[PDB]
């Protein structure tokens, strides 16, 4: 199913480019790991790497341009209305085409940005979240699963 992964600050002001406001009543916390706040804490990246391991990643063009090189050993799927500008990754012109390009896999990872997260959140089954404190440090990694009726 579809999963989102994101890093969220505690007192965030949510506009269009941000991870959406999600309804806590609709999400079950299934894993929570708290840790010491450390500057440039290396575990932040390791968390992303572990959780995206060997899964297709979908991202919007802005996010693609902020990263700039393909995440290795992952099909990298970039959403853009325009023809692609990097032959190392897969380019698609709609959400449906992005899902289609992933094939039959156990899990699809959406890695941002705000416009892309907003379109995929309503179809998502899991969230992988890094919670960030008032001076920009992670303090907790969390996995949530969507609550079904
Ligand atoms: N909290 C987190 O962990 C996290 C993670 C990653 C990124 N981010 C933030 O997200 C920011 C980017 O957010 P963003 O909203 O500006 O951009 P974004 O979602 O990365 O990219 C938006 C671009 O993707 C393409 N796109 C999106 N939906 C589409 C659709 N349905 N059909 C076709 N193309 C589509 C469009 O590209 P064209 O203009 O080419 O048509 C659009 O301009 C970054 O600056 C970063 O700071 C946060
Ligand atoms: Cl939600």
């Amino acid at each position: 199913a579809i999963s989102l992964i994101a890093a969220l600050a505690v007192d965030r002001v949510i506009g269009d480019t941000h991870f959406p406001d999600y309804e806590p009543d609709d999400w079950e916390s299934v894993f929570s790991e708290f840790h010491d706040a450390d500057a440039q804490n290396p575990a932040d990246l390791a968390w992303f790497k572990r959780n995206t391991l060997d899964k297709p990643v979908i991202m919007g063009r802005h996010t693609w341009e902020s990263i700039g090189r393909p995440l290795p050993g992952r099909k990298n799927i970039i959403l853009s209305s325009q023809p692609g500008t990097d032959d190392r990754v897969t380019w698609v012109k709609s959400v449906d085409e992005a899902i289609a390009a992933c094939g039959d896999v156990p899990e699809i990872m959406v890695i941002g940005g705000g416009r892309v997260y907003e379109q995929f959140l309503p179809k998502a089954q899991k969230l992988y979240l890094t919670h960030i404190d008032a001076e920009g440090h992670s303090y907790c990694f969390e996995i949530l699963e969507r609550r079904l009726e």
Side-chain angles (χ1 to χ4, degrees), residues 1-32 34-39 41-48 50-114 116-148:
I2 292 162
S3 303
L4 278 43
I5 180 158
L8 308 184
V10 168
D11 173 30
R12 64 203 188 96
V13 173
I14 300 171
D16 293 332
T17 65
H18 296 251
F19 190 83
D21 172 32
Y22 62 100
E23 173 52 76
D25 288 349
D26 288 349
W27 292 89
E28 182 83 17
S29 189
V30 301
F31 170 97
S32 52
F34 294 87
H35 57 265
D36 284 310
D38 174 48
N41 187 344
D44 294 350
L45 188 60
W47 170 261
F48 175 90
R50 166 66 186 83
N51 293 304
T52 62
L53 180 65
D54 194 22
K55 301 171 196 178
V57 298
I58 299 169
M59 74 193 86
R61 187 188 44 82
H62 297 325
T63 298
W64 163 252
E65 287 170 17
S66 67
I67 292 162
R69 61 204 283 174
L71 301 180
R74 293 166 259 174
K75 181 168 199 183
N76 283 231
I77 298 165
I78 324 302
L79 271 161
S80 172
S81 61
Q82 297 314 303
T85 63
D86 199 308
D87 283 0
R88 298 175 291 169
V89 300
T90 297
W91 300 79
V92 298
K93 294 169 149 77
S94 62
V95 169
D96 283 343
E97 285 185 6
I99 286 167
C102 288
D104 184 349
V105 295
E107 189 174 20
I108 295 167
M109 300 294 293
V110 171
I111 71 166
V116 172
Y117 288 135
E118 192 81 56
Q119 291 165 275
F120 283 90
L121 175 62
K123 295 183 259 291
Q125 190 271 330
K126 186 169 272 188
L127 306 181
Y128 300 84
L129 301 181
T130 303
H131 299 280
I132 295 164
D133 65 22
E135 48 274 338
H137 307 303
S138 67
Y139 67 95
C140 191
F141 297 130
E142 195 180 19
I143 303 171
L144 304 93
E145 287 192 301
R146 185 184 291 272
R147 292 186 176 114
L148 306 173

